[PDB]
Amino acid sequence: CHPCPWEWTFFQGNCYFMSNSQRNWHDSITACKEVGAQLVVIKSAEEQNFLQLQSSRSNRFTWMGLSDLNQEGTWQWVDGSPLLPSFKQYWNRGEPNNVGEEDCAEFSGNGWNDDKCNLAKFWICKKSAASC
Ligand SMILES: NC[C@H](O)CO[C@H]1O[C@H](CO)[C@@H](O)[C@H](O)[C@@H]1n1cc(-c2ccccc2)nn1
Ligand SMILES: [Ca+2]
Ligand SMILES: [Ca+2]
């Protein structure tokens, strides 16, 4: 039995996957849906540091499933769940700044940054690990 698919990464009962091509934010969640996964929604502190590490050490700007397209200033994960105050420390200093209108969040260096959703970047999918 295999808890995660071929060449996916495993962490705390979940299966993650960093793309090796680039897409815009909407095309990215589509991509994850195509594999029965979701553009990552972070739920733990350790999950953040885990993903933030894989993303940085590959020197790749990476989409995550977080946006404010429901309403400006209201950051909300693609599962509807809101962005908790606890998680707001993971923004990069001076972010989110909404320079030129920016409604989607990405892994950039040590933390997160808001960028333009139509800007093409890499992405990370998340799904529940299978039971053995
Ligand atoms: N992958 C994105 C990468 O991290 C680059 O980040 C920067 O440019 C991104 C633009 O693509 C921003 O969305 C980030 O906020 C960040 N920025 C931009 C600015 C800024 C402010 C005033 C005038 C001009 C520029 N201040 N911070
Ligand atoms: Ca914004
Ligand atoms: Ca920004």
CA gap 72, 52 in Å, rounded: 25
5 cis-preceded (ω within 30 degrees of 0) = no
Other CB atoms within 10 Å distance of the CB of residue 97: 11
113 Cβ inside 6 Å of ligand 1? yes
99 in a labelled binding site: yes
Coil, strand, or helix at residue 27?
helix
Question: Which ranges of 23-121 would DSSP assign to H, the alpha helix?
Answer: 25-34, 45-57
Transcribe 45-60 into DSSP letters: HHHHHHHHHHHHHTT-
Coil, strand, or helix at residue 5?
coil
First and final CA of the chain: distance in angstroms? 6
Amino acid at 48: Q
68 Cβ inside 6 Å of ligand 1? no
CA gap 79, 107 in Å, rounded: 18
Q: Do residues 125 and 105 make contact, with C-beta atoms less than 8 angstroms apart?
A: no
The pair of three-digit structure tokens given for residue 68, joined into one six-digit string: 């404010």
CA-based nearest residue to 62, from 14, 18, 118, 16? 18
103 CA distance to ligand 1 middle (Å):
13
φ, ψ at 19 (rounded to 5°): -65, 160
Q: Do residues 91 and 110 make contact, with C-beta atoms less than 8 angstroms apart?
A: no
Residue of 59, 99, 106, 123 best suited for mutating to test ligand 1, as the one with most atoms within 8 Å of CB: 99
Coil, strand, or helix at residue 89?
helix
CA gap 100, 116 in Å, rounded: 8
Expt. technique: X-ray
The pair of three-digit structure tokens given for residue 44, joined into one six-digit string: 């733990």
